[PDB]
Design an enzyme around this catalytic site. Structure first.
Site, mmCIF file in Angstrom:
data_model
loop_
_atom_site.group_PDB
_atom_site.id
_atom_site.type_symbol
_atom_site.label_atom_id
_atom_site.label_comp_id
_atom_site.label_asym_id
_atom_site.label_seq_id
_atom_site.Cartn_x
_atom_site.Cartn_y
_atom_site.Cartn_z
ATOM 1 N N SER A 41 0.806 -1.216 0.000
ATOM 2 C CA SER A 41 0.000 0.000 0.000
ATOM 3 C C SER A 41 0.843 1.272 0.000
ATOM 4 O O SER A 41 0.348 2.320 -0.429
ATOM 5 C CB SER A 41 -0.961 0.003 1.189
ATOM 6 O OG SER A 41 -0.265 -0.243 2.395
ATOM 7 N N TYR A 110 19.826 -9.369 -3.372
ATOM 8 C CA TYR A 110 18.727 -10.081 -4.015
ATOM 9 C C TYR A 110 18.881 -11.573 -3.784
ATOM 10 O O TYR A 110 19.964 -12.129 -3.988
ATOM 11 C CB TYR A 110 18.711 -9.808 -5.514
ATOM 12 C CG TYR A 110 17.668 -10.603 -6.284
ATOM 13 C CD1 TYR A 110 16.339 -10.528 -5.933
ATOM 14 C CD2 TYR A 110 18.021 -11.413 -7.356
ATOM 15 C CE1 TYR A 110 15.387 -11.232 -6.594
ATOM 16 C CE2 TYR A 110 17.069 -12.115 -8.053
ATOM 17 C CZ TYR A 110 15.756 -12.027 -7.666
ATOM 18 O OH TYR A 110 14.791 -12.721 -8.335
ATOM 19 N N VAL A 111 17.802 -12.209 -3.359
ATOM 20 C CA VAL A 111 17.798 -13.645 -3.082
ATOM 21 C C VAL A 111 16.884 -14.308 -4.108
ATOM 22 O O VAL A 111 15.655 -14.254 -3.954
ATOM 23 C CB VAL A 111 17.303 -13.892 -1.657
ATOM 24 C CG1 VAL A 111 17.354 -15.375 -1.366
ATOM 25 C CG2 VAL A 111 18.132 -13.096 -0.652
ATOM 26 N N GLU A 115 10.402 -16.517 -1.656
ATOM 27 C CA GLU A 115 9.863 -16.536 -0.303
ATOM 28 C C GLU A 115 9.530 -17.947 0.142
ATOM 29 O O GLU A 115 9.019 -18.768 -0.633
ATOM 30 C CB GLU A 115 8.579 -15.699 -0.229
ATOM 31 C CG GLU A 115 8.792 -14.234 -0.519
ATOM 32 C CD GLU A 115 7.520 -13.436 -0.667
ATOM 33 O OE1 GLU A 115 6.415 -14.004 -0.568
ATOM 34 O OE2 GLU A 115 7.651 -12.200 -0.847
ATOM 35 N N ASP A 154 7.300 -9.050 12.647
ATOM 36 C CA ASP A 154 6.599 -9.416 11.417
ATOM 37 C C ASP A 154 7.048 -10.778 10.914
ATOM 38 O O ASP A 154 7.203 -10.989 9.709
ATOM 39 C CB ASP A 154 6.735 -8.349 10.332
ATOM 40 C CG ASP A 154 5.575 -8.364 9.350
ATOM 41 O OD1 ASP A 154 4.521 -8.984 9.652
ATOM 42 O OD2 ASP A 154 5.733 -7.760 8.280
ATOM 43 N N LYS A 156 6.667 -14.199 9.445
ATOM 44 C CA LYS A 156 5.695 -14.926 8.635
ATOM 45 C C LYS A 156 6.442 -15.460 7.420
ATOM 46 O O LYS A 156 7.519 -14.966 7.109
ATOM 47 C CB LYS A 156 4.530 -14.027 8.203
ATOM 48 C CG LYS A 156 4.925 -12.785 7.429
ATOM 49 C CD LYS A 156 3.715 -11.958 7.119
ATOM 50 C CE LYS A 156 4.106 -10.727 6.402
ATOM 51 N NZ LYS A 156 2.890 -9.871 6.141
ATOM 52 N N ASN A 159 8.133 -13.256 4.633
ATOM 53 C CA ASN A 159 9.267 -12.407 4.960
ATOM 54 C C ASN A 159 10.561 -13.186 5.125
ATOM 55 O O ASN A 159 11.568 -12.628 5.586
ATOM 56 C CB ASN A 159 8.967 -11.621 6.237
ATOM 57 C CG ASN A 159 8.013 -10.487 6.000
ATOM 58 O OD1 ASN A 159 7.737 -10.145 4.843
ATOM 59 N ND2 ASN A 159 7.558 -9.848 7.069
ATOM 60 N N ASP A 172 12.250 -7.690 5.322
ATOM 61 C CA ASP A 172 11.168 -6.851 5.791
ATOM 62 C C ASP A 172 11.296 -6.491 7.259
ATOM 63 O O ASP A 172 10.699 -7.126 8.133
ATOM 64 C CB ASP A 172 9.801 -7.440 5.494
ATOM 65 C CG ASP A 172 8.752 -6.364 5.418
ATOM 66 O OD1 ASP A 172 9.034 -5.232 5.917
ATOM 67 O OD2 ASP A 172 7.674 -6.643 4.850
ATOM 68 N N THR A 189 0.926 -8.899 11.289
ATOM 69 C CA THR A 189 -0.008 -9.549 10.385
ATOM 70 C C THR A 189 -0.978 -10.384 11.216
ATOM 71 O O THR A 189 -0.538 -11.092 12.128
ATOM 72 C CB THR A 189 0.794 -10.437 9.415
ATOM 73 O OG1 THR A 189 1.787 -9.643 8.734
ATOM 74 C CG2 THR A 189 -0.100 -11.053 8.400
HETATM 75 O O1 LIG Z 1 12.284 -5.675 1.433
HETATM 76 N N1 LIG Z 1 11.295 -6.332 1.741
HETATM 77 O O2 LIG Z 1 10.471 -5.950 2.651
HETATM 78 C C1 LIG Z 1 11.046 -7.586 1.040
HETATM 79 C C2 LIG Z 1 11.925 -7.997 0.058
HETATM 80 C C3 LIG Z 1 11.663 -9.165 -0.632
HETATM 81 C C4 LIG Z 1 10.535 -9.917 -0.326
HETATM 82 O O3 LIG Z 1 10.258 -11.065 -1.015
HETATM 83 C C5 LIG Z 1 9.669 -9.496 0.676
HETATM 84 C C6 LIG Z 1 9.920 -8.319 1.357
#
Ligand SMILES: O=[N+]([O-])c1ccc(O)cc1
Length: 338
Positions: A41, A110-111, A115, A154, A156, A159, A172, A189
């Site tokens: 959002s 970057y991964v 998720e 957070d 979950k 994340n 996150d 959440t």
């Molecule tokens: O930076 N972030 O909050 C993320 C980055 C990647 C992701 O898949 C989820 C959250």
């Protein structure tokens, strides 16, 4: 003493960066935009490529005006200040941050494996050894964060990214906060909220241990313990003190979960006199070599399938929208420290 000295050094190093945060260490036109990896959002996460080095990164972009509107100013400042100061094997590395007239930017490793949520939903549920491998990494990560007086808030599967070795990278930090004693913000959440958050209490790090109970349950069952169509119905179940366990759960798993999903925060594992050791010494973790996990010497239950450091196959498809930068500065005062 080895753990005490490790955590003392960890806190020293965190505090140095915490007190003198990095700022303004790149700019947007140093990167090429590749793909939108996720949206929210008040921001989005993009795959970008650095034009000089060729390295790929995940770039989180937050719209300053939407942050103000959604009352996330303090949270966005927490997020960046914490991420630039932490250092742990299972925490995503922030490489750059900067801001411009419209947006805040955080540029992270970057991964490509994506998720945990996607992998969990693809396979259905994880075996207990598989869930335990991930849970152990979270236990160590929370031991680290909590020692630094940080609450994560957070936890979950969305994340938790799965890296090229099959290990977790927590991302996150949007709700993470440095807290001595209690804090009060309603955030998180719904499925993962501890009772004391729902009831508007001044809460502490025990909420992260509750959330670990939810995560372990979800990893091992394939669905979270408190589920319903409306958040209000989820919250009723959470505060009730009742959870049903699948018959396939081991007795050790059920016992650990009853102690993490303990509604009375003063009785909850992770929040007792022995702290994290009540969890690390629990029978469900008897097969865990905590040092080997930390050192990343355990072979993982699985490695995500990906073709290279720029592969986006493990992320999903979103409408590609502009990254607009206004000709005029927005919310300069609110984000001065960023
Ligand atoms: O930076 N972030 O909050 C993320 C980055 C990647 C992701 O898949 C989820 C959250």
């Amino acid at each position: 003493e080895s753990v005490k000295e490790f955590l003392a050094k960890a806190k020293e190093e965190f505090l140095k960066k915490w007190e003198s945060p990095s700022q303004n260490t790149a700019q947007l036109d140093h990167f090429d935009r590749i793909k939108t990896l996720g949206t929210g959002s008040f921001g989005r996460v993009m795959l970008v490529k650095h034009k000089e080095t060729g390295n790929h990164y995940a770039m989180k972009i937050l719209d300053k005006q939407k942050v103000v509107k959604l009352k996330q100013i303090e949270h966005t400042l927490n997020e960046k200040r914490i991420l630039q100061a932490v250092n742990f094997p299972f925490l995503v590395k922030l490489e750059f941050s900067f801001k411009d007239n419209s947006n805040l930017y955080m540029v992270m490793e970057y991964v490509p494996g994506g998720e945990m949520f996607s992998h969990l939903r693809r396979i259905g549920r994880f075996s207990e050894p598989h869930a335990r491998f991930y849970a152990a990494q979270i236990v160590l990560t929370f031991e680290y964060l909590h020692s630094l007086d940080l609450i994560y808030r957070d936890l979950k599967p969305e994340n938790l990214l799965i890296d090229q070795q099959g290990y977790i990278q927590v991302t996150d930090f949007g709700f993470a906060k440095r807290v001595k004693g209690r804090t009060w913000t309603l955030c998180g959440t719904p499925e993962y909220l501890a009772p004391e958050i729902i009831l508007s209490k001044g809460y502490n790090k025990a909420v992260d241990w509750w959330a670990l109970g939810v995560l372990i349950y979800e990893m091992a069952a394939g669905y979270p313990p408190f589920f319903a169509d409306q958040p209000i119905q989820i919250y009723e179940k959470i505060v009730s003190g009742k959870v049903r366990f699948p018959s396939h759960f081991s007795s050790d798993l059920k016992d650990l979960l009853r102690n993490l999903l303990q509604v009375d925060l003063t009785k909850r594992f992770g929040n007792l006199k022995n702290g994290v050791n009540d969890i690390k010494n629990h029978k469900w973790f008897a097969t865990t070599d905590w040092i080997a996990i930390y050192q990343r010497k355990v072979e993982a239950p699985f490695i995500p399938k990906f073709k290279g450091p720029g592969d986006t196959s493990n992320f999903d498809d979103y409408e590609e929208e502009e990254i607009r930068v206004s000709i005029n500065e927005k919310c300069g005062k609110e984000f001065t420290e960023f």
